[PDB]
Design a binder for these strands. Structure first.
Ligand SMILES: [Mg+2]
Ligand SMILES: [Zn+2]
Ligand SMILES: [Zn+2]
Lengths: 101, 214, 64, 137, 102, 91, 82, 103
RNA sequence: GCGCCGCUAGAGGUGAAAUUCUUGGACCGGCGCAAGACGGACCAGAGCGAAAGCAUUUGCCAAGAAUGUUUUCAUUAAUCAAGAACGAAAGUCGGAGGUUCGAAGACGAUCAGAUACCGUCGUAGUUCCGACCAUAAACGAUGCCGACUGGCGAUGCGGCGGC
RNA sequence: UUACGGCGGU
């Protein structure tokens, strides 16, 4: 739990409320940093991957470290066919026709 | 409209029993109004006090820190937090045409009080010396600096905090690494420059009340 | 805040000053002790050894 | 009778006084011995209406008077001095309103203990705002 | 013409020195061209010595000094007149001016 | 032989896709296909499985690392600071 | 000094030059006889030694190699030979 | 990280030049069970239960274990050869003092 | 920069001033934490390096001059078309970082005009990694090797000799 | 703080 790790540690997959089994900063390469505990009114703040800092509970359980799979968006998709295969596994959203067209 | 200096009341601050003058001064804090109690509002206040308004004859260029850890009614009882030199003395002793040597070591006592020690020292121009530069060679410095941090490693790791800071008022450590280095190169302004505190051992309340004992 | 309008006798005149030759530095003594003596600047003709009256006594002399 | 500490005639209580005498303004802020509880902060720019004179030595003079007229009013009776410059990246000399705010604090009924310079000196950091060829007036 | 034998700078067996910055104008100068001045000015401003010691809580208090090192670019060393232009034969000396304290 | 002179691994893309984009891939692509020395068995058998998943040819031990390379520089900076915070102050 | 007879120098001036640069060159080394304390064995050790010389029977260390000229370990019996 | 770790591995290649030794796992396991092995050296890289029984046999044979700070490919070049070696056992030091060192 | 307190309306900045920051409490003071740069004073007509260049400690690695030498080899050398290695700062591509400073830019000023100096803010950049680029007032504006030709005091590193 | 110019040949 984030009430025991000291300030400036690097955290992924932290619960946004106690018991939630892990919600914040989950995707590949992201991490969250804890800052500024408050030992009375037990509640700490963190630094999310959007840069938005957010005060959460002090007993939010959370796994130490950064997510594996980082650097994933550095390589270009580089052609339309490998973007077909990228979104075949996710949803039905890929060929986005311009609304002007 | 409202005066905030009516809702404050003056406490008074005590020193450890190892010092001669025991009564430092008079801090103040606001009164208790609901949550804001008048006992955490003044723990952890550092009282940057020198020796000469805390001893009877000892020098003024050495100051101490004395964090409050407890309040016992009106009294505001303190424990040692660190020392350093005043900066006017700290740069009166840094002159040209001498080599300044310094060392540092992280030592804990036998009492659970991990400290960080800073010591300095200056090569000495001799009494019949005619040449202007009394410089040391670099291997002489590396074995002076090895000898400096070796000695205060011992004279903290011997016994508890109470005899280590009491070593400090006397400031012998600097005299001992004075005498034990002048068969390598002669030195003369050899002080423990700054002492910094790193750990507190669980704050046993009986240990503080011994340090404010007889 | 309220000061006495104090009179003070001059020692040696420290020459003219004031970028037009208009002010003279005088070093007055405060008529009750000669150990207390501030350097100040007056305009007009002086005559070493006389007494002039300060409207307010200690502010500033000429130093950059 | 809520204001004033418990002193006899001869015993006096100390508070440190921060003389931040940089350029362009002057602070004659005074506080207690631990340095946490501000007793009376007054500033040289709060007692002129000219803004050239925020760092004038005369503004520092009457700023020291009111902070001595309020300190002595409360029950704190003698002062330690902790003069600053700007320090750090900037200049390290005190401004014009250093000595006059310190001398008027001695003439206007206040006792003085330890004085010590406390301006921030770095261990070689933080490139200075001038450019390379400096400010060219 | 080469004006001075060293080039205004005290480097001989080097290629590069630390650059330092001027005090008032913050200009980048090398450490060995810049005009240095170490100042041991008393912090009490001696006109106000017999005005604070009678307000002191002591009977003999050794006043702290102020320890400021100046170092100037030569563009501001001449303008603030810490150095003066010298004649071409009275120039070949490195000896500092006499002190004259009392 | 010296078969090609600039393109190297991204000659498989041919004359397509751009000049910066083929140049941008040929660092990532030589990185994701390399055999790395395994830190657990010493052999050069860390071959990339799926993205972020790295595996030994012998001793069969799967390490979850970076996407294209075995140690992300952001991962080593964290691990060097995590073990700092564990020993410093001891929580 | 237009008439220094630079074929006949004094031996004092000859001693205080380099070991090269002399009118005839000659080394500043010598050989020395050293009685180690407690044996009959005279050692014939070279002056500017570079090795640690050990004695044969009473095998203690005799000299230490140092910067120019070898420092003998014990204060010992000692003479310059030839 | 500067001057004097030529206590451990420069004494090691000395024994490689002079004395006698075995390299590899099942050679040392034979030498340590018949008492002829004087000092076994493990890598930083060796698997954790293999380390636990070589240390355990040295508890039985009353021999020394040195935990070489280095990889198994780093200990191999420290031997002076192009293998990788996790475990060795020296059975006869030449004239150095690896055994008469710190353990 | 961010917490938590303290007191109060200014703070900043300039030759002056304004843009700006501020009772959702700024500046100031105190204690804590974080991050990235940078190693002050010691620091010199000191030192090393082929040149560029190099300053916080301890520590694996490999190198180097100088000195010492009654060792060794016995001309192996010197300069060098071709061809190579290294090369400040800025610059480019990609990746981490992003405190400070800050091209561009925005605004304030000052000016007859200000696309400038002066001020607030600020992108690229300055920091690390990898790949490039090979130019500088890269200067001692003096190629390298060799010899000879006045003196004096001093310094630095070895060596030797003495109150 | 602001201070910009002065036709050609003799
Ligand atoms: Mg489209
Ligand atoms: Zn300047
Ligand atoms: Zn493997």
């Amino acid at each position: 739990p984030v009430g025991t790790m000291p300030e400036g540690t690097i955290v992924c997959c932290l619960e946004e409320k106690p018991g939630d089994r892990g919600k914040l900063a989950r995707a590949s390469g992201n991490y969250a940093t804890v800052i500024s505990h408050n030992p009375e009114t037990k509640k700490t703040r963190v630094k999310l991957p959007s840069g938005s800092k957010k005060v959460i509970s002090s007993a939010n359980r959370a796994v130490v470290g950064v997510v594996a799979g980082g650097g994933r968006i550095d390589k270009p998709i580089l052609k339309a066919g490998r973007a077909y295969h990228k979104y075949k596994a996710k949803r039905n959203c890929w060929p986005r026709v311009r609304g002007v067209a | 409209v409202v005066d905030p200096f009516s809702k404050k009341d003056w406490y008074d601050v005590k020193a450890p029993a190892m010092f001669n003058i025991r009564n430092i001064g008079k801090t103040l804090v606001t009164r208790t109004q609901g949550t804001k109690i008048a006992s955490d509002g003044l723990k952890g206040r550092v009282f940057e006090v020198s020796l000469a308004d805390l001893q009877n004859d000892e020098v003024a260029f050495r100051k101490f820190k004395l964090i409050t850890e407890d309040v016992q009614g009106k009294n505001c009882l303190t424990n040692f937090h660190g020392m350093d030199l005043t900066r006017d003395k700290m740069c009166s002793m840094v002159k040209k045409w001498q080599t300044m040597i310094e060392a540092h070591v992280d030592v804990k006592t036998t009492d659970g009080y991990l400290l960080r020690l800073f010591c300095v020292g200056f090569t000495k121009k001799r009494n019949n010396q005619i040449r202007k530069t009394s410089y040391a060679q670099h291997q002489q410095v590396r074995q002076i600096r090895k000898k400096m941090m070796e000695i205060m490693t011992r004279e903290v790791q011997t016994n508890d905090l109470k005899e280590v800071v009491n070593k400090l008022i006397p400031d012998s450590i600097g005299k001992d690494i004075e005498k034990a280095c002048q068969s390598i190169y002669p030195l003369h302004d050899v002080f423990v420059r700054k002492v910094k505190m790193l750990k507190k051992p669980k704050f046993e309340l009986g240990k503080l009340m011994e340090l404010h004992g007889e | 805040r309220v000061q006495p309008i104090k009179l003070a006798r001059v020692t040696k005149v420290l020459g003219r000053t004031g970028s037009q030759g208009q002010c003279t530095q005088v070093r007055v003594e405060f008529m009750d002790d000669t150990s207390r003596s501030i350097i100040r600047n007056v305009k007009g003709p002086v005559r070493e050894g006389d007494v002039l009256t300060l409207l307010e006594s200690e502010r500033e002399a000429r130093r950059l | 009778i809520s204001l004033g500490p418990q002193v006899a005639e001869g015993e006096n209580v100390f508070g440190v006084c921060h003389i931040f005498a940089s350029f362009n303004d002057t602070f004659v802020h005074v506080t207690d011995l631990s340095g946490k509880e501000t007793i009376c902060r007054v500033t040289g720019g709060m007692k002129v209406k000219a803004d050239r004179d925020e760092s004038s030595p005369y503004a520092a003079m009457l700023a020291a008077q009111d902070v001595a007229q309020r300190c002595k009013e409360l029950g704190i009776t003698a002062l330690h001095i902790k003069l600053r410059a700007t320090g750090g990246n900037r200049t390290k000399t005190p401004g014009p309103g250093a000595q006059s705010a310190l001398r008027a604090l001695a003439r206007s009924g206040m006792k003085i203990g330890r004085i010590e310079d406390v301006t921030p000196i770095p261990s070689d950091s933080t490139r200075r705002k001038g450019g390379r060829r400096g400010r060219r007036l | 013409t080469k004006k001075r034998r060293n080039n205004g700078r005290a480097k001989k067996g080097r290629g590069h020195v630390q650059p330092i910055r001027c005090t008032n104008c913050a200009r980048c100068v090398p450490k060995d061209k810049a005009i240095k001045k170490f100042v041991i000015r008393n912090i009490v401003e001696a006109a106000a010595v017999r005005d604070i010691s009678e307000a002191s809580v002591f009977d003999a208090y050794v006043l702290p000094k102020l320890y400021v090192k100046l170092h100037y670019c030569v563009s501001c060393a001449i303008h603030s007149k810490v150095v003066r232009n010298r004649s071409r034969e009275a120039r070949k000396d490195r000896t500092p001016p006499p002190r004259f304290r009392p | 032989a010296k078969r090609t002179k600039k393109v190297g691994i991204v000659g498989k893309y041919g004359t397509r896709y751009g000049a910066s984009l083929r140049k941008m891939v040929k660092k990532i692509e030589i990185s994701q296909h390399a055999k790395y020395t395994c830190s657990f068995c010493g052999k050069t058998k860390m071959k990339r499985r799926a993205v972020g998943i790295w595996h030994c040819g012998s001793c069969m031990k799967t390490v979850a690392g970076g996407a294209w390379t075995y140690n992300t520089t952001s991962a080593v900076t964290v691990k060097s600071a995590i073990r700092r915070l564990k020993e410093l102050k001891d929580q | 000094p237009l008439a220094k007879d630079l074929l006949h120098p004094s031996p004092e001036e000859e001693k205080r030059k380099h070991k090269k640069k002399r009118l005839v060159q000659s080394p500043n080394s010598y050989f020395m006889d050293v009685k180690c304390p407690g044996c009959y064995k005279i050692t014939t050790v070279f002056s500017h030694a570079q090795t640690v010389v050990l004695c044969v029977g009473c095998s203690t260390v005799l000299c230490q190699p140092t910067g120019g000229k070898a420092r003998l370990t014990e204060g010992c019996s000692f003479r310059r030979k030839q | 990280t500067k001057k004097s770790l030529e206590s451990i591995n420069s004494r090691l290649q000395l024994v490689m030049k002079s004395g006698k030794y075995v390299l590899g796992y099942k050679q040392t396991l034979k030498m340590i069970r018949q008492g002829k092995a004087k000092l076994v050296i493990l890598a930083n890289n060796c698997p954790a239960l293999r380390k636990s029984e070589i240390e355990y046999y040295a508890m039985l044979a009353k021999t020394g274990v040195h935990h070489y700070s280095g990889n198994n490919i780093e200990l191999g070049t420290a031997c002076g050869k192009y293998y990788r070696v996790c475990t060795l056992a020296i059975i006869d030091p030449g004239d150095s003092d690896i055994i008469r060192s710190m353990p």
